[PDB]
Amino acid sequence: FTPVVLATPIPEEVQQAQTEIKLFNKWSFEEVEVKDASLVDYVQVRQPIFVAHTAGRYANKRFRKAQCPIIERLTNSLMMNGRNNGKKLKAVRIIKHTLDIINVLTDQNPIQVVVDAITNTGPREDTTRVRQAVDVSPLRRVNQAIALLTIGAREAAFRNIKTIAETLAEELINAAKGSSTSYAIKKKDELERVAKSNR
Amino acid sequence: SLVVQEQGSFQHILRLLNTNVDGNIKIVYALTTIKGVGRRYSNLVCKKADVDLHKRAGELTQEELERIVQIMQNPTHYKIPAWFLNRQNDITDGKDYHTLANNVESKLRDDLERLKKIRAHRGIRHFWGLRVRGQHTKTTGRRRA
Amino acid sequence: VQTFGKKKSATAVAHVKAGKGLIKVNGSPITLVEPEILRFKVYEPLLLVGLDKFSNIDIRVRVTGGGHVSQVYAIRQAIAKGLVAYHQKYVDEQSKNELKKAFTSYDRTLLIADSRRPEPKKFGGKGARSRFQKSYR
Amino acid sequence: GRVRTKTVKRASKALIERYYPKLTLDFQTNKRLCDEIATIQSKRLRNKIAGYTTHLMKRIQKGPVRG
Amino acid sequence: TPVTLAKVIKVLGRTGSRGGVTQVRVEFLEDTSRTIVRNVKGPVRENDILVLMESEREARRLR
Amino acid sequence: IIKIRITLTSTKVKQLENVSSNIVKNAEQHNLVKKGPVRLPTKVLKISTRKTPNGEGSKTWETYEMRIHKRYIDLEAPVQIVKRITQITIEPGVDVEVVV
Amino acid sequence: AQHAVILDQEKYDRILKEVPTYRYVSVSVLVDRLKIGGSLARIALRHLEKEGIIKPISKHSKQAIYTRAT
Amino acid sequence: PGVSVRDVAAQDFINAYASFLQRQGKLEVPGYVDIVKTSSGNEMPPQDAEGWFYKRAASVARHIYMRKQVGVGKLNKLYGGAKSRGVRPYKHIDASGSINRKVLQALEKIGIVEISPKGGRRISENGQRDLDRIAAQTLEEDE
Amino acid sequence: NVWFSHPRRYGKGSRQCRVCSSHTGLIRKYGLNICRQCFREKANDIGFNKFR
RNA sequence: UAAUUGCGAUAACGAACGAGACCUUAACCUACUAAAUAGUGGUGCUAGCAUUUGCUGGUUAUCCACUUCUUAGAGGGACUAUCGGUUUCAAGCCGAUGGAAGUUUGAGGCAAUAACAGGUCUGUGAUGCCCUUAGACGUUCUGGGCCGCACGCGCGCUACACUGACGGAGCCAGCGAGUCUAACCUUGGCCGAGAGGUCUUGGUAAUCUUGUGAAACUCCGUCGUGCUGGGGAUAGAGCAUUGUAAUUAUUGCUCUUCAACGAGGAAUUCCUAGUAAGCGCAAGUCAUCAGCUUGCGUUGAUUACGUCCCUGCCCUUUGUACACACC
Ligand SMILES: [Mg+2]
Ligand SMILES: [Mg+2]
Ligand SMILES: [Zn+2]
Asked: Name one GO biological process term (chain G).
């Protein structure tokens, strides 16, 4: 299918980006849909990116943070514990390895898997210290979902054999499938439990 | 890597120069249990004896163990520089050893005892239990117990 | 024919000349920028506009002055600006406009240099804003 | 905030009070004649005065304003 | 678990002692002819969508 | 003719550029060829010190600056005219060094 | 020396028939699935990729990403 | 087909040039192997004793190829990293000057790198030849 | 005569402020050799000015 | 509104200081000027690879052209521009587009009436008064002390490990400093395992140190989750450097023991974008000595775009038997 070649010898696996439907270096990007209808316009798949390193100004304004690619948002949220401040190359390599593990296990378009996981672990209701049950906006839902997922992956990869990428993969898989065996879902239902007791 | 079945030649925790060496880790770091040999001394010994550093003491050998012991007790003759040893120009002979036994503690207490017997400041500080290398005792190492 | 690219402090000078698709970064091909993860970040301005699309031009960049990521962004934008300027000068103007629109619809500072500069540090604390820890008692 | 001080607002007001059959509601041509009809001692202040004069001229055509 | 969702049409203003909550007037997407005022923790703009497990509770100001 | 390099150095930019232009014009009215006046980067001799003459108060630092601006103009001329060019430069504050 | 230090000899059976019942295999997965201690995991994982049933997904280092071959 | 040293950048080229240094038979080793850490800022010797000197020589030769004359001080700065100074913050320390100098002398005795008219050492004619042959072989092995 | 001079070629006792003779707070940058207070006093007089 | 910033209301009107304006710096400018103290194109010098001339290489007295990179003078540019919505009447605010830059464009310098018994007589050959002034409280020399250790507190550095440690490889900045009355930054060669030692060289400086071949970082390996290969406290031996003089180890280096520490209670600090944080570098103190400071640059988040719940401050109202003004 149009195997064009260049004077610089490079594999055609990189030229295969735009010859057909645009997609990641490895993963299709068009077949992503949020399973809910509320968190739309805050997950920013499509626009697609070639790698989760879009170093763009996303903090000058209030709501520009929402249009950042969600893969880069999770890559950024991996950049914690102080020691791993910075090291965006490390974070994006971890994200690549995690997408690969989600591909190996019930692939389901791993970027779509993480989208579904974030939507399923975004807390729909919280409590404010007045303790009154208030609602949660989609932006807070997305940021809290990403924070819970990365924190669970962080404290699962902490002091154990399995690497950060696979702890992240198993956390995101359990959040996408909506099982209460993982940290993000457990803490989301913990936050949602005090909704009838705080009204 | 290969077949290491060795149903009868496998070694559990073993005895080497008066202390117990764990056969479940590579020989270089297994040797570091001996009080007197550290990371680089063990690394030098285990490959001066040309033994495989990628395998543990549990499968290493039975004779190269004693060869490693000998290369440790007599490093100077067997092509090892003086500066690599922990006790050179010891106190009274000028020739260099490397104390590898339950004897490095004995030589340390010997140095402390001769310092205290000759009434040097360092020996006096060691007798009192205070810091001896010019540290500030005002705020650090208070409990020390 | 000669464009530049900067991200924070790195500057990459791009020379675009009549040639046959030679994309050199420091004398090596574009396949040897070697952060091993931003190689696609240097591939962006090719796969954006045209897969090869270019048997008539040669791009030779030289980058210095920043850090690894700053240089990677500097070349990834210098080569795009060189392509735009080449189409502006020689090839065609509607072609230049279409290719610039294709660049901007994916813009990752491929065409406009990032304006963020390091804020000067002020006394009383490490960094421009963070202050030394203060104790009352 | 982008609030304009006295030295901008009063200068723009006077510029309108004496140069109405003059500079239109475009800032580019509003700042040009400021150099010849006013001795401003800094280009930033000149730009501020010209911008406020442009704003006042753009809002004068939709109802007279005070002063 | 009953299903219900709505969209904020008008954000009234900040509320709470420290100002962490916002009062928003929400319109139910199904049965659009009903407006209810609710409290939201996160940032909110217009034409935004909220999921509220509880459906009919007029959230009051939070002193 | 003699090829030389005149170096002008000072902290006053206006006074230094005055001679850096006077030399050029005095070589133009005599119709010489010169490699145009090169502007070497201004050296900021910034020096940070403590505002307090004692040890009390908020730790407030203040930096002074001395901007040394240097320029160099290289040309050729015979002795009788090069001496006139090196005697026109009497601007207070700017030091002028001629090298053959 | 908590489990499966160097020997893994009595339990040869499912070191070949291990890709069934779990698709993912890695230097840490071998540790996780109660068979071999990770002291030899990164050197045992080279055997099956040189010849066997696990196909590598990339040139990953400090981690392994392998799949069952169809 | 017009292959230079700049067609494989970082790792495959060194891992092949060191293999050529094995094939050549000339060890050129000063015997410091098994004794040196390669830097005062290090804490362990190289993990493989046979091979580290060949890799150092390969990378040194490639480094001198890629640029103009390079001296032992520049090699010390290049190959010296950060030092764990204990409870103190890490600091850069220059690499082993004797090791770098002896590697350069070995490359001199091989004729791949020669003295420079302004100081340091520039890659020589047969040095360029050998480096480019290794680059071509590496390309044909894996592009 | 042979006891009234301990050698002071180096150290904080070797140099003094050229104005006030203090051995503390000395500024030896650019060869100023002025105490950090006397330099603050006579800073504009030397050519050092505050801009930022 | 950041602002007594302005709109507006109105016995006020018109103004002044402060704020702002201003100045410095960091952003852009294929526009002007000029650059073997900056760089890029090609000619001969043409070593490599490939061989229809192509890649990268190299030529500090080797040619021509120029200023895209760099430098710095003169200027330009932003004034929230345009367009919507919100304003009560506007000042303004909020979005989108354009723009290099739309949060005072970012950051500083300067900064009114004044108040403190705030600190400094240990900066001043600034100083009133008091004390001393030849067994001196002057000055100098020797030695010690300022560091001294049941203990409490504060600023910090290193950690508790795999998002890691170690070993090889990749080799990427910026702000700066540097000796002619003489010893500074040091390139290169040589010796040494290391620190370091020796012979020269370049630099009074956009020239040389220096392209500061910084670190974090990236790649490939070893490690396999253990008081372990995390961690480097404590101590011993030996080797050098600086210093007239290293003992109470100045510092560096090699070996050797490998202490607590498994993420830290009550409390508590800083911080809103190239910012926090991580990371190192230069300068200052310097004969030597960083875990300190002042700046610089590398990687670059999370969250928020509000409020008076706490704290502090300001304004207004009010009480006063205060006015030396609650000491
Ligand atoms: Mg003290
Ligand atoms: Mg200090
Ligand atoms: Zn003084």
From this structure: cytoplasmic translation
B64 CB-contact burial (10 Å; exposed 0-12 / middle 13-18 / buried 19+): middle
Which two structure tokens, joined as six digits, stand for A63?
Answer: 């709501």
Residues of chain C neighbouring A47 (CB-CB closer than 8 A): 106
State the amino acid at position B48 in one-letter form: K
Q: What is the CATH number of the domain that holds I46?
A: 4.10.830.10
Contacts of C106 (CB under 8 A, 6+ apart): A47, C44, C48
CATH fold for domain D6-61: Diphtheria Toxin Repressor; domain 2 (1.10.60)
Query: For residues C34 and C48, is the Cβ–Cβ distance under 8 A?
Result: no
Which structural technique was applied?
cryo-EM
- Closest to D15 measured CA to CA, from D40, D34, D43, D29: D34
| DSSP 8-state secondary structure symbol assigned to residue I12 | T
Task: State the CATH architecture for C1-123.
Answer: 2-Layer Sandwich (3.30)
Pairing of strands C57-64, C23-24: parallel
Tell me the angle at which helices A88-104 and A164-177 cross, rounded to the nearest 10 degrees: 50
Asked if I47 has any chain F CB less than 8 Å from its own CB, the reply is: yes
Number of separate domains in chain H? 1
Q: Are strands H121-123 and H113-115 parallel, antiparallel or unpaired?
A: antiparallel
Please say whether the beta carbons of H83 and H40 come within 8 A.
Answer: yes
> What domains are there in chain E, each with its CATH number?
1-63 (2.40.50.140)
Number of residues that this document lists for chain D: 67
CA atoms within 13 A on the CB side of A149: 39
The CATH number of whichever domain residue A42 belongs to comes to: 1.10.455.10
Rg of chain H over Cα atoms, rounded to whole angstroms, equals: 16
Chain J positions within 7 A of any protein Cβ atom are 1-3, 5-9, 15-16, 19-28, 30, 33-37, 39-41, 47-51, 54-59, 68-74, 76-83, 90-96, 98, 100-110, 118-120, 122-126, 140-142, 147-179, 186-197, 205-206, 210-211, 213-226, 228-229, 231-239, 243-245, 247-258, 262-263, 268-281, 283-288, 290-309
C7: closest chain A residue by CA: A55
Q: Beta strand F61-64 with H113-115: parallel, antiparallel or unpaired?
A: unpaired
Q: Chain H residues with CB inside 8 Å of C32's CB?
A: 6-10
Residue range(s) defining the domain that contains residue B42: 13-78
Q: Which two tokens stand for residue I8?
A: 């002071």
